[PDB]
């Protein structure tokens, strides 16, 4: 009832802030006809670490052309549109790239899905900043290569190529700071 | 309890031996021995952390570059086969402050540089013989984790961290990224 109660309080307040951000992002996408047309690529959900925004490929509409870390026009549009809204709260963010463009776990001695995934996370980062994301908002960029694929190769594997933007709650941010500072 | 905690002690002792082999290896080889000041190896709650840090007069990468210096290549390829001798997976993180904070709204910044240096390190570990599947993720932290304000010993702000994960840490990181 002591520390825990006050702990739960802060947790709930943070959730309410991230929940409002979630509704705000969904509304931004809905009210803009061009962004709404791109909604099939957007998946937003609340996770233990905060609020996750995934921008996923479709086979006919990839956010990055195969083998490239250059954003497509609609990818730039999505990122620049959400940027100012992400500034609505003080929370920092992490960007993670998931990529399977190149042969699965092959020729990893050179440029592979590791470099491409990280480069795509950073390309997305640059668009958020160009779109107005406050300086210092980003806390981490991650390349996950194809280690978190959601589908084996085939007609529905476009989901293996996606950019994940995680708006970190206090604990998640603290866990990251501790991870790189402890000892 | 004793069972799970007993397995924790076993893995702990395994990683502690890795630490000993690494120290023993670096000490035995004249070349690695001379580079030891750049190598920090210690047991952490997450497993075993290996940090390769810059010195003011000897950076692992030239300023603004993700190209490894000869000695950085040597260090990474030397430790790869030792790390490959155990099952534990690895996480790589790059820390860099080469570019001014302003380079953010720019194009190439410490974000790109840190991630690129993390991957450049990853590639050297592979060249050194690291098994496929060992690397769990590559991270770029830019200059968010500075250990010293710009100045005399800010060389510490440029470093590559390689974390050899114990079972609990591996699972925690995987669970986290399945939510990312």
Swiss-Prot record, chain B:
Keyword set, alphabetical order: Cell inner membrane, Cell membrane, Chemotaxis, Flagellar rotation, Membrane, Transmembrane, Transmembrane helix
Membrane in keyword set: yes
Residue ranges constituting the OmpA-like domain according to the UniProt record: 48-168
Subunit structure, as described in the record: Each stator complex is composed of 4 MotA and 2 MotB subunits. 2 A subunits and 1 B subunit are thought to form a single ion channel, so that each stator complex contains two channels.
Localization terms from the record: Cell inner membrane
Family: Belongs to the MotB family.
Topological domains, Periplasmic: 1-175
Chief location: membrane
Lipid bilayer topology: Single-pass type II membrane protein
Keyword S-adenosyl-L-methionine applies: no
Recorded superkingdom: Bacteria
Role according to the record: MotA and MotB comprise the stator element of the flagellar motor complex. Required for the rotation of the flagellar motor. Might be a linker that fastens the torque-generating machinery to the cell wall.
Cellular-component GO terms for this entry: bacterial-type flagellum stator complex
Name the record gives this protein: Motility protein B
Biological-process GO terms, alphabetical: bacterial-type flagellum-dependent cell motility; chemotaxis
